[PDB]
Design a protein around this ligand. Sequence first.
Ligand SMILES: NC(=O)C1=CN([C@@H]2O[C@H](COP(=O)(O)OP(=O)(O)OC[C@H]3O[C@@H](n4cnc5c(N)ncnc54)[C@H](OP(=O)(O)O)[C@@H]3O)[C@@H](O)[C@H]2O)C=CC1
Ligand SMILES: [Zn+2]
Lengths: 342, 129, 115, 96, 209, 146, 87, 145
Amino acid sequence: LHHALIPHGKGGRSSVSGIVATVFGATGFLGRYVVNHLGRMGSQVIVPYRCEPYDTMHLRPMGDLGQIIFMEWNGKDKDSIRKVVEHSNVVINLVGREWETKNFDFEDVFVKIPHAIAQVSKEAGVEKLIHISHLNADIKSPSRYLRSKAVGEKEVRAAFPEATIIKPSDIFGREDRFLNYFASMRWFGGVPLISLGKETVKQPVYIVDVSKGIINAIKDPDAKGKTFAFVGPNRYLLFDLVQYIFAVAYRPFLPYPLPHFAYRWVGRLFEVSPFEPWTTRDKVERVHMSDMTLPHLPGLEDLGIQATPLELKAIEVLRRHRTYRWLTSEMEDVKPAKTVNI
Amino acid sequence: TQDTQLIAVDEKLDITTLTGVPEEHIKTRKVRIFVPARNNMQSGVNNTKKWKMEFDTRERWENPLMGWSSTADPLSNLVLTFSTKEDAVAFAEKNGWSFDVEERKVPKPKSKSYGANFSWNKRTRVSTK
Amino acid sequence: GTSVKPIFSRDMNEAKRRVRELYRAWYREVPNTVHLFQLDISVKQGRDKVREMFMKNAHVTDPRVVDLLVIKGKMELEETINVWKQRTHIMRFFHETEAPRPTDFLSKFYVGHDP
Amino acid sequence: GVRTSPTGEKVTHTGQAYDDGDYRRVRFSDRQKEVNENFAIDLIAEQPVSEVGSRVISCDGGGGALGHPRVYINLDKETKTGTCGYCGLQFRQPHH
Amino acid sequence: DTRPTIRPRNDVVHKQLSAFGQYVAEILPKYVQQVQVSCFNELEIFIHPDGVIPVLTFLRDHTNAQFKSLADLTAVDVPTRQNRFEIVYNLLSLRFNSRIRVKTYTDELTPIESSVTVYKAANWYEREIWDMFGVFFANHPDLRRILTDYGFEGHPFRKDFPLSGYVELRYDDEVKRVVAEPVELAQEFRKFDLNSPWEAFPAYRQPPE
Amino acid sequence: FAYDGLKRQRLTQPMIRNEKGLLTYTTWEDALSRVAGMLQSFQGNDVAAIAGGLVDAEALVALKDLLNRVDSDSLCTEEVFPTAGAGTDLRSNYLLNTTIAGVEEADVILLVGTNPRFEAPLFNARIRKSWLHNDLKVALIGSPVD
Amino acid sequence: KLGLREIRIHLCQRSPGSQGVRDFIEKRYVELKKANPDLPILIRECSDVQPKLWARYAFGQEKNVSLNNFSADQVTRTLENVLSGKA
Amino acid sequence: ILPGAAYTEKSATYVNTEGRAQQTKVAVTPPGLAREDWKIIRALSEIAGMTLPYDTLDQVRSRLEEVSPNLVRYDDVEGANYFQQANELSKLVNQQLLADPLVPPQLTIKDFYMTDSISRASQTMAKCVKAVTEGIQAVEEPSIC
Ligand SMILES: NC(=O)C1=CN([C@@H]2O[C@H](COP(=O)(O)OP(=O)(O)OC[C@H]3O[C@@H](n4cnc5c(N)ncnc54)[C@H](OP(=O)(O)O)[C@@H]3O)[C@@H](O)[C@H]2O)C=CC1
Ligand SMILES: [Zn+2]
């Protein structure tokens, strides 16, 4: 091992764990908690950013002084990744957008950027690399999202034969835009769902389980090469998802059956918005399509991670969206939805 | 000695539950006491008159950004003053600290005879003063 | 002599009473504590987190120490009635964010020189 | 005078240089490991050695009160040149 | 003093305070143990713990003393004694412009009758002392923490309490509010054992033992 | 003057033979498994141990009980002793029985095959003080080293 | 296995309980060691310790037996029984 | 390679030549990944299968108590005796004495310096080796500052 790299201290803010993290796109939900755990135990974290440094300031109070270093970086410019990943031990890829922008397409951020980050990291000579791809990554999937993850996973697998690809099923949390999605749905009158959402079962997993699983994969000496899939502890129908979360918000649930094409159209008008889109046609397919089960792929329990139940952590997000009439209502009042778990 | 509803609670004092130092720092801390030894280049034996309480030196790692000796044990610089050793151990029992006792290394009472520096047969005579 | 003056609990029995109404106040305090204090933990884990602290101090035989502790018990209790503490203040009892402490000999050997 | 390490970074006056395999160097990326150009090693050797004609000399360091406390250095060793530890400048006998 | 370096003396006051020192001694022989006036004209009354409330009452009430001002409450902790904490009061007599010091001793467990009744100023001074040192007094109105952090465990001023504390806190985004953790300093307190190894004062030296 | 030695050539991390048979730094896991894998499979005189010249007693107990459970009694030491006779049995056979303070009351000392002036400098200072004040006689059997 | 490897006869130089075992080793020792040249007879004489016999068997086994106030003949009786179970 | 710990980096007990137990205490933490020497073995015993009962410093300290009560009374010596038995126990086949003269391994200052691993690793101690074996020329460092 490197001479000035041996772990030291009792896993604190000022301790030394020996991990030179290089999380990319940490200015997001997964990045926010990943740098938190890395900073918490004590590890040098190199965070490249593309957006305004002001938005990245909320990661400043996340580690000891000189442990978090912010670096400018660009996806297209190869030299940008080289500077970030040169003095590194683990480079983990968290870059990727749920929608499409004019400069960066779906394949650009999910295949091209992962292709660049994997090739440079291997060429630089980092010992480990972790890549994030959707658990539903499928080449024939109707959504360009999941197709891009599949080919992107294939590319980083070939370029980096020791990369530990991560397969989260459906992430949820405070700023998760997954249950915040259905929570924000009450604004547009009722709750539009395709065929009332009775033919879609998902298995969401909360942030800390996948987040802790990341560093556990970093600490795991045998995690290289594997394709761990981080999945939740329970499976519920899509109708049960909206039923439960609206109940925790106590907002009046108004089920609204929709044809598939009308919902596809609705994403089109909402994609026109020059600002950040609310609903996209790709998001239409993702919420419509159902989560798949991959028992052969190792799960999250193999890394000593217990999948937190959705009902236990759903209140942490639903409190913000609920009204004053039930703001102080607890979580025992609501009852977890019908689990159709495997 | 002052009879005010006195009850014979003669069990060893256990103030650890009240002072509430963390579990790692009440069991896994060998508290040791001695009398400090006088610095040899000094001639200051008066500093060897007090019983002193110490701890065990834990990990002292170097800071990445500068190189420091960041410590994780709060009881690193803590030393305590005791007139006699029985008071020092008495504090250890009430604070339930695993105690170790050394003894006061009193100096030998050496006999100095300057007249012996110039003898007729004894080897103690000095070749140069 | 070794005989000492008690404050309130002359022996174990009255001290055992004093730890009992602490439970009496605490048990009906946890429900509306979560309710008022905007807490996201349920009553179930609220109740037993009052529990294990009784066994956290379930070894002292001196009545005074139990009495010295009974005052602090209602002190933290009263501090919770009138919202004096903040969310983090009571969260400090809920050990939640620290790394788990190693227990078996293999773990501390693999961690460092910690004895 | 400042040298350059094999990794391309200037070495400090104390001789400290970051190893090429070191990870903490990245703090120098987009920044500088600035080094005091006036090396105290090279800032005192070229000062002339004085040739006072006396056995013992009081060195003050210049400026009187502003200099270092007065130190009485000795000049009897012919092979070695006397010097004041406070300042480091040289002293010498008048060639005797 | 023809020499302008050393501090002068007020022998008239020193004897005068000493006369009042023995004055209190006969008045309350049950409670006082020894009364001493220091070289720098500071006469201290040393009273028994259980008689804390009467002596303070006597000084507040008696015409010849009339000490009605609770200047300060201190309980200086000395680990070498059996009952470590020695509780020290501080009184000022306005009519006789003189200061008196009455003090007791009390271990970590022995309770003292609160002097709030005899001195309303003792109230908040009482809330501080139990916080810093941990000596509970009896029947205090609202004896409760008023200095340390809400729920901060342990009395910080105790000798066994390290100056750096036991816990430190830091904001955490994964829970979105501040949270505590064991203290782990960037720089430890570098102890400076600078005490001179040579005797400094022959006058105050303890007898051989 | 030995603190500088504590800074030179320090064993920092476990090292095991690589694919080419060269020592390379590795984690404790591989080193522990490799030694354990080669230990429990061997028994009797196959497993042995040699103590150093500066090893502490607690380590010696550790190997004594470790080789206890593997049927190994070949726990050798660098120092060699004529075990014939009492040897290890009687502690008076090898102990400085009179204690180092005893020289200041002796009369004659026989140094057999040793250089206490160099082997044990603190010892030789004690005889020197004894020879100075007590006029204690000395005589050795060995090379006439000063 | 359960065979003799060495003995550890801990005793005190002054305790009356250790006097009996002390009575044993003044004269009845040279024949015991000569009878078991391979068996080392370790005498750990630490003060204020009641005499303890420690027979270390194979496989990391070590049984103890009391010798408090055991006179010269009877300390020989119990240790010979340990010798009798040499395997 | 099993990185142990030096005496300054170890809180353990040695015994002098007179059979007096003296315990050292840790002053500097062992560098890097090195751990306590006995902590290594106890970890080794657990990973091998024949786990030792003792796991902390006091537990192993009690182990030397039950195998050798002498080396736990710190600074307290124990009077050695039964020399009347040791000599009569030697008393045997009487192997002869070699004609080789008695030559101590340490005869000069130089070989006295170069004994143990720490002395071998040390550099300033090696400067003293150069001083005695050569003289004053090379070893004279200019004491300018
Ligand atoms: N249910 C889900 O949402 C699932 C998501 N994932 C993937 O895991 C990751 C989680 O991201 P999350 O932390 O939630 O952040 P977001 O998805 O909310 O935002 C994207 C993240 O990547 C960065 N980023 C976005 N676009 C680019 C770009 N073109 N170039 C470089 N960086 C970019 C963002 O910072 P910035 O905008 O400043 O560049 C931010 O850190 C994403 O890749 C996501 O697709 C995987 C499985 C499930
Ligand atoms: Zn000068």
